[PDB]
Design a protein around this ligand. Structure first.
Ligand SMILES: O=P(O)(O)O[C@H]1[C@H](OP(=O)(O)O)[C@@H](OP(=O)(O)O)[C@H](OP(=O)(O)O)[C@@H](OP(=O)(O)O)[C@H]1OP(=O)(O)O
Ligand SMILES: [K+]
Ligand SMILES: [K+]
Ligand SMILES: [Zn+2]
Lengths: 274, 369, 64, 102
């Protein structure tokens, strides 16, 4: 279990090894079985000067080859060594190296005017930031409504029902699911907010003149033959959506083909997995 | 209970980075949709962000870097190639149709919300599109073209003396760091993998410079970090940070590629652990601006930011995922939470305490009483 | 044949679905120079372009 | 009404939901709720769940309908005997209402 410094026959630094077994033969000759510690070069910088790797290479050599004893510590114990106790004899290991395979456990920051940002000075108590909020945002849902969860929930059911009845006027479960998709819901939450959270006013919006409204996402909206085109273009060009349009669906806008793609990936008849 | 403002533009899910590319904006649309069906949408103030114009993007970036972005297309892609190389647009930052539109929405969300925070008409403001933290003044990097974060922070400085920037993303937030490297008004704290990983920056010894020295905190990490290890090193450090840097507005980048089973990431965090950080920050009751960032196993990105939105509303949600347009995306399980993997945590207690202590020293160098 | 914006002007990429056999349904990716020369792998493309482009981070399959 | 009967044929369900019984019920729902549109709509979706009104036409089973067409073709318009011998579990007055609708 001890670690030793063997002869380096070339004149170079000593080879390091761990003693697995010490053997004496009948004629009193002493031989040792030893696991090799490899040097970083020999393992054929983050590697320190005194890095050694524990190999799966096993050799046996006579005891006369041993010139000195050493310590090959854990990484933590090497880093903890004091400046005075630093020696030629201290080495460390943190890696096991397969010598046969080659296997091993498993960029600059700049300064200057052209790198840093000019820091924006704090405004005086009298100074004003001068930022037009309408040019920056437009609100889509207020969180403090005169409405209760129940009523919003209820409205969402209604928004769904209209939608199903809409697509009944030019498959029952199919139309209902179609009408239950998110686009219809999102549209239902906007219809509320646009109408100032007045349920009675918002419902008119949904049935403008006795006629219902239809919201269809790209999934539902595409024709049978467009859908068909898409499944040919994908299976032929993979996920290259600009070429899929150029050559297969050039009348559609790229971003509609994207939206469709993702929605199509959940398709039932779609089974790429097993 | 804190008031939350949520920023979203429907178009953002539909912009596409390119075949074979890991960054997929669609993950925000997935979140959006869960939020609606988990009933959370209902409970917060929902804003569509108008497009940020070159006017306010050049408040940090080059007049001719933005000019380049406004101009570049896939049409004139072979005509510009000169400028393409000077600005880093290629191998892992593709050109793609709508690119500049995408940037405007991400930046608009963050800026609008910053204003909202300065105008003191919210407590928390959320923009999952934003958080794109690798961008530089005069070049794109790591999927980031415009650094919405910097711009956001620059607006906050108009009302806030000290702005704290916290970055959970597995990748070191070098864009936000470099932009504020020489100032004492903004402190950039970042916990990330380090060693054969992008962006190559943010080791223990990355402390800042000039007036900004002792104001850039970093925590370098190896693979496989638990929720338990992460929690035990985040809370101590952040409490000291608050203690010392005493900020008046927080900006938390909630990068979701620090979660377990990410495509690019190699950390072992659960939504629960990841969120515990957001909850801890929120607890310090400061004007807060949650942004997203990285995340490349989008099913979990969706889960995470949905959950973390609940946290900002301190409302409970069930593990049962609600039906939605993309419901079928979520495995055989259709649950909200993820559990950690058998993956081995190479962040030994000894290694974390060495670093922790070094940082506690760095933070002590700040003024106090 | 689609323009590949990250390569120099005129370079194009095409993806072809295999129609039969062992890998029916899988695809192969090809690149074409401006003159129309066809390339079938990353090392072949990198050998042709040499130091005029750095392809270290180039994803042959997606063209990004 | 159509969305109600979608939760356990599209045009059929819509027509079913468009029959008079549903309308009459809609005019009462208004009056009972004091002509408050917002209040009346809650009535229609009591707890997030819709309401179904089905007249005897729609309500009868396939096999009851069948029974009726045998009883008529066999006893003509003698509706007490049609019940006694063919649909004895139904009330006479429901068989009448059905007849006319049929
Ligand atoms: O449609 P994309 O945006 O290109 O992403 C897909 C998608 O990943 P997401 O579902 O996370 O978006 C596939 O997942 P499924 O459609 O199979 O659920 C995934 O397949 P695996 O999850 O089986 O890896 C595939 O990866 P690959 O192309 O390696 O098959 C990957 O495409 P990208 O790798 O181009 O992102
Ligand atoms: K980070
Ligand atoms: K700094
Ligand atoms: Zn990242």
């Amino acid at each position: 279990g001890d670690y030793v410094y063997f002869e380096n026959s070339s004149s170079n630094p000593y080879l390091i090894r761990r003693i697995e077994e010490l053997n004496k033969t009948a004629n009193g000759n002493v031989e040792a079985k030893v696991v090799c510690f490899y040097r970083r070069r020999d393992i054929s910088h983050q590697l320190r000067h005194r890095e050694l790797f524990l190999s799966r290479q096993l050799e046996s050599l006579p005891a006369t080859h041993i010139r000195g004893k050493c310590s090959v510590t854990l990484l933590n114990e090497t880093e903890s060594l004091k400046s005075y106790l630093e020696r030629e004899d201290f080495f460390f290991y943190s890696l096991v190296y397969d010598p046969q395979q080659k296997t091993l456990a498993d960029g600059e920051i700049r300064v200057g005017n052209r790198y840093q940002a000019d820091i924006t000075d704090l405004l005086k108590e009298g100074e004003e930031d001068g930022r037009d909020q309408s040019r920056l945002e437009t609100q889509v849902w207020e969180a403090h409504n005169p409405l209760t969860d129940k009523q919003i929930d209820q409205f969402l059911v209604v928004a769904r029902s209209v939608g199903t009845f809409a697509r009944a006027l030019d498959s029952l479960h199919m139309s209902a699911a179609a009408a239950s998709r998110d686009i219809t819901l999102f549209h239902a939450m906007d219809t509320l907010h646009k109408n100032i959270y007045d349920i009675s006013k918002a419902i008119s919006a949904l049935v403008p003149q006795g006629g219902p409204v239809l919201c269809r996402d790209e999934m539902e909206e595409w024709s049978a033959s467009e859908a068909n085109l898409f499944e040919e273009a994908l299976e032929k060009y993979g996920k290259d959506f600009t070429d899929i349009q150029q050559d297969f669906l050039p009348w559609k806008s790229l971003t509609s083909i994207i939206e469709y793609y993702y929605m199509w990936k959940t398709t039932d008849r779609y089974v790429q997995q097993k | 209970r804190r008031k939350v403002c949520y920023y979203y533009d429907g178009d953002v899910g539909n912009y596409y980075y390119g075949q074979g590319h890991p960054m997929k904006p669609h993950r925000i649309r997935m979140t959006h949709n869960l939020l609606l069906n988990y009933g959370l949408y209902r409970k917060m103030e929902i804003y569509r962000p108008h497009k940020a114009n070159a006017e306010e993007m050049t408040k940090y970036h080059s007049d001719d870097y933005i000019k380049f972005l406004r101009s570049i297309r896939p049409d004139n892609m072979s005509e510009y190639s000169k400028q393409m190389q000077r600005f880093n647009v290629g191998e892992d930052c593709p050109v793609f149709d709508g690119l500049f539109e995408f940037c405007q929405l991400s930046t608009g969300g963050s800026v609008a919300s910053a204003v909202k925070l300065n105008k003191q008409q919210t407590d928390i403001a959320v923009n999952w599109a934003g958080g794109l933290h690798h961008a530089k003044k005069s070049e794109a990097s790591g999927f980031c073209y415009v650094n919405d974060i910097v711009l956001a922070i620059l607006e906050l400085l108009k009302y806030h003396q000290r702005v704290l920037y916290i970055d959970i993303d597995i990748h070191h937030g070098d864009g936000v760091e470099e932009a504020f490297y020489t100032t004492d008004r903004v402190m950039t704290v970042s916990f990330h993998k380090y060693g054969e990983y992008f962006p190559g920056t943010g080791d223990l010894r990355d402390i800042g410079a000039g007036k900004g020295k002792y104001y850039a905190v970093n925590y370098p990490l190896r693979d496989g970090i638990d929720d338990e290890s992460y929690e035990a090193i985040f809370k101590p450090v952040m409490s000291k940070v608050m203690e010392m840097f005493q900020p008046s507005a927080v900006v938390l980048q909630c990068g979701s590629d620090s979660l377990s089973g990410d495509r690019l990431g190699c950390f072992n965090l659960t939504i629960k652990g990841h969120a515990k950080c957001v909850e801890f920050v929120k607890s310090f009751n400061l004007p807060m601006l949650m942004l997203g960032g990285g995340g490349y196993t989008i099913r979990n990105v969706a889960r995470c930011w949905t959950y973390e939105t609940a946290v900002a509303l301190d409302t409970e949600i069930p593990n049962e995922l609600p039906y939605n347009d993309y419901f079928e995306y979520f495995g055989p399980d259709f649950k909200l939470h993820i559990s950690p993997s058998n993956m081995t945590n190479q962040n030994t207690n000894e290694y974390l305490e060495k670093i922790k202590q070094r940082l506690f020293e760095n933070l002590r160098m700040l003024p106090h009483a | 044949r689609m323009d590949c914006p990250a390569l120099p002007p005129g370079w194009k990429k095409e993806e072809v679905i295999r129609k039969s056999g062992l890998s029916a349904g899988k695809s192969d990716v090809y690149y074409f120079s401006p003159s129309g020369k066809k390339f079938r792998s990353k090392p072949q493309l990198a050998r042709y372009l040499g130091n005029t482009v750095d392809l270290s981070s180039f994803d042959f399959r997606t063209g990004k």
